[PDB]
Write an enzyme that holds these catalytic residues in place. Sequence first.
Site, PDB file in Angstrom:
ATOM      1  CB  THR A 139     -54.989 -99.005  37.904  1.00  0.00           C
ATOM      2  OG1 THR A 139     -55.615 -98.485  36.610  1.00  0.00           O
ATOM      3  CG2 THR A 139     -55.960 -97.918  38.688  1.00  0.00           C
ATOM      4  CG  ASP A 197     -58.492-102.149  30.546  1.00  0.00           C
ATOM      5  OD1 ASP A 197     -59.706-100.961  29.507  1.00  0.00           O
ATOM      6  OD2 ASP A 197     -58.816-102.291  31.208  1.00  0.00           O
ATOM      7  N   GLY A 198     -56.275-104.283  26.696  1.00  0.00           N
ATOM      8  CA  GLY A 198     -56.038-103.793  25.156  1.00  0.00           C
ATOM      9  C   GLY A 198     -55.809-104.452  24.534  1.00  0.00           C
ATOM     10  CG  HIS A 216     -48.925-105.692  23.679  1.00  0.00           C
ATOM     11  ND1 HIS A 216     -49.355-105.940  24.653  1.00  0.00           N
ATOM     12  CD2 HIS A 216     -48.779-106.480  22.497  1.00  0.00           C
ATOM     13  CE1 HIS A 216     -48.840-107.261  24.425  1.00  0.00           C
ATOM     14  NE2 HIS A 216     -48.707-107.484  23.031  1.00  0.00           N
ATOM     15  CD  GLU A 271     -47.305-100.229  31.638  1.00  0.00           C
ATOM     16  OE1 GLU A 271     -47.172-100.404  30.273  1.00  0.00           O
ATOM     17  OE2 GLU A 271     -48.414 -99.641  32.106  1.00  0.00           O
ATOM     18  NE  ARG A 290     -24.476-100.757  40.539  1.00  0.00           N
ATOM     19  CZ  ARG A 290     -24.591 -99.819  40.960  1.00  0.00           C
ATOM     20  NH1 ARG A 290     -25.021 -98.920  41.619  1.00  0.00           N
ATOM     21  NH2 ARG A 290     -23.803 -98.717  40.591  1.00  0.00           N
ATOM     22  CE1 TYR A 332     -44.425-104.843  35.844  1.00  0.00           C
ATOM     23  CE2 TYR A 332     -42.877-103.528  34.159  1.00  0.00           C
ATOM     24  CZ  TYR A 332     -42.974-104.563  35.469  1.00  0.00           C
ATOM     25  OH  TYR A 332     -41.943-105.089  35.758  1.00  0.00           O
ATOM     26  CG  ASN A 333     -48.223 -97.053  39.370  1.00  0.00           C
ATOM     27  OD1 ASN A 333     -48.782 -97.398  39.704  1.00  0.00           O
ATOM     28  ND2 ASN A 333     -46.881 -96.127  39.293  1.00  0.00           N
ATOM     29  CB  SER A 348     -47.582-105.052  39.812  1.00  0.00           C
ATOM     30  OG  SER A 348     -49.157-105.368  38.982  1.00  0.00           O
TER      31      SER A 348
END
Lengths: 262, 262, 262, 262
Positions: C159, C45-46, C221, C121, C146, C161-162, C164
Amino acid sequence: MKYMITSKGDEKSDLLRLNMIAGFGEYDMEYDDVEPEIVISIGGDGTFLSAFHQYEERLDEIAFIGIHTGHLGFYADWRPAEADKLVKLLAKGEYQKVSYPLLKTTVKYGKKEATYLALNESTVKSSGGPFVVDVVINDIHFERFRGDGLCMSTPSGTTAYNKSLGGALMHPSIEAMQLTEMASINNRVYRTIGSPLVFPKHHVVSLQPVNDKDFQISVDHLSILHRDVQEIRYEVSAKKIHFARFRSFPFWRRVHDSFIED
Amino acid sequence: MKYMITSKGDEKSDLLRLNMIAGFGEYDMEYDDVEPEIVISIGGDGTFLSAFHQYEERLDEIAFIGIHTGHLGFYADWRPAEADKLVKLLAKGEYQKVSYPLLKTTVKYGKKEATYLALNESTVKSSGGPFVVDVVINDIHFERFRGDGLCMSTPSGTTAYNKSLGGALMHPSIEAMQLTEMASINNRVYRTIGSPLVFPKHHVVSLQPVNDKDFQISVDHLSILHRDVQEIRYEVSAKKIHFARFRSFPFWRRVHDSFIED
Amino acid sequence: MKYMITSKGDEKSDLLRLNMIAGFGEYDMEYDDVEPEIVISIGGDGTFLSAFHQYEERLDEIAFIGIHTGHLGFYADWRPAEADKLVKLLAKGEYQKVSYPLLKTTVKYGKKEATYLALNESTVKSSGGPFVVDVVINDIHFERFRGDGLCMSTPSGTTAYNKSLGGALMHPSIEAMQLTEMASINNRVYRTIGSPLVFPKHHVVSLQPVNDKDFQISVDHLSILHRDVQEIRYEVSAKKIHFARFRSFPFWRRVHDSFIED
Amino acid sequence: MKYMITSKGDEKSDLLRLNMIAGFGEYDMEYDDVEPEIVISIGGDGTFLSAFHQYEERLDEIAFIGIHTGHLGFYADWRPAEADKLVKLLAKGEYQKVSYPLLKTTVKYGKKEATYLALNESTVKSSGGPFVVDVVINDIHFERFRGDGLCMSTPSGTTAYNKSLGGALMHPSIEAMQLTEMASINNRVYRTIGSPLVFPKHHVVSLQPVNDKDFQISVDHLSILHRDVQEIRYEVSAKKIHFARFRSFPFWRRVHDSFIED
Ligand SMILES: NCCCn1c(Br)nc2c(N)ncnc21
Ligand SMILES: NCCCn1c(Br)nc2c(N)ncnc21
Ligand SMILES: NCCCn1c(Br)nc2c(N)ncnc21
Ligand SMILES: NCCCn1c(Br)nc2c(N)ncnc21
């Protein structure tokens, strides 16, 4: 006895400090910021932390006190209105002491070793790349952690960063340390425990690099980029912080006042 | 000595049980399921739990052993292939014992009082209506809890229901109990701590009704609808469960094998 | 038509790329990495992300394809064994297209403005100090955040970072964006919503500094330290990414294969 | 037109209701609780829910209004002081309408089928035994769920039970449904997605029993024990609820007022 007083540096805290000194002058009390026996912190928990680390090499000959000129704090838990009454029983000595566990942090390099003492917690994130470490507990490979980082907290530290990561709050009389995950990545390929872990005295949690050997390590308020890191080593410290007890202020009451309502 | 063996009732477990008895017949070992000194559980952790509660009135004269004929369990942590070697050193006695903390649960009514002992956890939900209770810790009102229910877990229980509720896993050598929230409702009007709480010995966590006085209370595997409840009372028990130690199988290794991979 | 192919640079991916080109030479297909109409990504995917950003200025004239030489990916979702069959129907054209929503990110300074397009994201953390921002939604002050930072995710980004951060996975046919919190600090003094938020098209979520005007902003990225930041502005983009559809591979099947088991 | 008014039954709500009727008598307005065109709810969101379900068979000929005599509610979002001004523009008609998506729930048995409409959510727990179901999405086996239960929420329902389970809050203009897990059990043996899932229109999420065929199913406020259940079927409804719009009260403002502070 000898004593000293640190201040948050704001106008309110400076003036309260001069008041307590003048009050202290009415007693057998030397001001010494070199070999003191009483350290009074005035401001917030951050002010207290700095006081803690300023004197971490004489921990077993010091009793700390926190005064909050702002909101209630878990270490600065005495209101300014109680300063003059604080001054009096501190001076007439004969008070009870209470002690909290501390977290020992060891860093090994490819030079030597660096040790640190933490009152709240120590965290490990990566230098920019992806954070990946193998987690060894008492010399057994427990997991390969992939994510933002890890946080090891003392008992009293559990109300700070630990709390924000889903960690449990534990009573500071429990000699233990707690490890939490920061945004862990979990799939069929990569597997972490998810749950926070709580360790007793004498258990050694070791982090070991997989690819990148550079990590941003925090210890309470310090944050330093360590390079060529071979191992990070966590365990409950043999050293304790000692508090001067003048009143019943239960930790759980302190937790209620800070999070439920005062 | 005297001993007994319970079985999961499946074909596999029954046959392993008869094998160990026949093996036991080759030694000085009486079979007594009334005043035994060794209780062997064969099946899963549930089989072990039942064995635990069957003999909870003679806890201090019994050493338990768990054998898992299925997947590895946190109490049934010996594979069937080690039965015959288990039989031999159990018989030649002279083994080390290990003990885990237990959770005391007290229920008061408007009759009398009912006490229970839990190896994993005790939970409190409502009888159908909304679950609302005031939470008192060492006689201080800590929070009004509104939600699905609460769960108080022993150290070793933290890998069961506690884990599913975001609770921390703690080493069973820590004499403590952990309380977690079940789907708590939080808004400006209603406020809970969210975080799991961990309590040391001698701290008393008391639940008190606000409206409905009827609660479905679970204690490990039992679940009973209690009516006219005035108070529910949690604390670390003075009683411990004793395990027969024949090998090093660290709790954390046991945690890794169950959740990361075997 | 015109086409091009990027590769993860590893031996496996380079060789598959030369194979598809040679296969492409057997058809009416020009290789052009300037004005292509078909972009094939080979790796993970990267690798796909880089292909996406390399050509983000011609999004509406390109149909992307992902091939995973490693594990299955949410964008690189075609196995290497299907390359030669991929080559054939790509060349005989007449395929269906599918489009995913994208996230527009605007940064305003005290110079000018900088806009970015994100397929997964965009995240905002602080430059070292504490991260504090006011959150404005459609011009209404919603919360003072904060904590460690915030993350705004596209549908298909959920699917990554979100996920996680406790965010929900949403079907990429839903034109929406999702915002999640990173280690938010919550007490009586400081209050965040906790829950992840999901926004429809045309809703504008704006972040505004309170003290520190410097933030580390990530867009997929890329990660760049922006200084003198007046505002960060999120909304669903008017631009879509277009995929070449050659087979039924449901997003939910893709989710199952990646997280439950393949 | 025809109209009717339900009340929370408390003194405050009854008196406000008689006030609005008397005010309504000053206009061309028939009171009919059989074929009304305007349904006014006075009390809380629960009062509104009951009003919703009382007339769910004429949804497309009714515009609802909520008045909160207590705290602000997400459906009862008009304060009592605005009743008399509410009366006037309701009567002079010519107002705008707004509609929220609804959740269709189908239950199949081994008799027939039962369908239900939910404004907040529908939940599925087990009859006492362990809750285990296979989760099928658009006819593909997605996961075997083991735990306390599942919850499928409408957009506007996401601020209720869904929020308590870690679900995301989504804007009610998004035609979608969201599924969350209740205390899921996750180990190497048993695997769930953990994340909440969000589904667009026309996606069918089906629950199918594995062992126990008896489930306690809730639909908003109803909770009924269904027996001999073959399948539970969730999808976004074709029916919408229609609200009478008299003012701008953004959903996100409504979210802020309820959870951050009013
Ligand atoms: N200004 C935010 C940090 C305040 N803070 C510090 Br510093 N230490 C603690 C601690 N132990 N528990 C709770 N809060 C803490
Ligand atoms: N079949 C599910 C329950 C199994 N189980 C029991 Br019973 N007790 C524990 C325990 N302590 N940790 C983990 N799992 C446990
Ligand atoms: N190597 C870890 C990142 C892989 N990854 C990327 Br890059 N994008 C996604 C995406 N959308 N969903 C899931 N995983 C993704
Ligand atoms: N007394 C507790 C339930 C109140 N409540 C109802 Br009923 N529905 C909702 C809803 N959608 N969002 C938020 N709260 C809601």
